[PDB]
Amino acid sequence: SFSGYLKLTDNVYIKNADIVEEAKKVKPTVVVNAANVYLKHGGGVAGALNKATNNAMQVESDDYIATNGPLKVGGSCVLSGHNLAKHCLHVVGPNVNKGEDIQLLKSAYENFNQHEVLLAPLLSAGIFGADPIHSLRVCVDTVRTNVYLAVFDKNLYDKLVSSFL
Numbered sequence: 614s615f616s617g618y619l620k621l622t623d624n625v626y627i628k629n630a631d632i633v634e635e636a637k638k639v640k641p642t643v644v645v646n647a648a649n650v651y652l653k654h655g656g657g658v659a660g661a662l663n664k665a666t667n668n669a670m671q672v673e674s675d676d677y678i679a680t681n682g683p684l685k686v687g688g689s690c691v692l693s694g695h696n697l698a699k700h701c702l703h704v705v706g707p708n709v710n711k712g713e714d715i716q717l718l719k720s721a722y723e724n725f726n727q728h729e730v731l732l733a734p735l736l737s738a739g740i741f742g743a744d745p746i747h748s749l750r751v752c753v754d755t756v757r758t759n760v761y762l763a764v765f766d767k768n769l770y771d772k773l774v775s776s777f778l
């Protein structure tokens with residue numbers, strides 16, 4: 614199962630890890646992707662997860678968008694986890710670099726509550742432009758299911774742990 618995690622709360626755990634390497638090692642039931650409404654997995658966690666699937670995630674995602682249209686900011690969809698997990702929960706957090714409402718980050722984390730355990734990144738952090746300390750706070754105050762957070766950047770991981778209330 615999950616190893617080397619620091620316990621933050623009853624249900625939130627955190628580790629300085631590459632989420633792709635973590636997924637390949639654990640092969641969890643659910644890996645969360647930091648998706649955009651179009652499921653265009655270009656950069657950040659999405660680009661890295663998609664690249665690990667040899668673009669199979671993008672092919673599947675384009676078929677999903679052709680049938681269903683775009684997701685909502687704060688919304689999600691469950692697709693295949695390919696070689697990384699049983700399922701991938703594509704969750705759209707607000708992108709602050711696109712003027713999206715930061716209040717939608719709580720709605721985005723509510724999607725995690727439909728899954729008993731998840732491997733996930735911090736929503737809206739990184740190239741999405743939100744403060745990762747705020748994202749972790751919304752995560753622990755919103756998610757009630759077991760979430761194992763993978764934070765790629767060591768310096769950010771240390772800052773998140775040392776500032777966690």
Ligand SMILES: Cc1nn(C)c(C)c1CC(N)=O
Nearest residue numbers: 631632633657658661763765
């Ligand atoms: C992979 C990966 N794992 N995690 C947690 C992040 C933020 C990434 C994105 C990247 N390094 O391209």
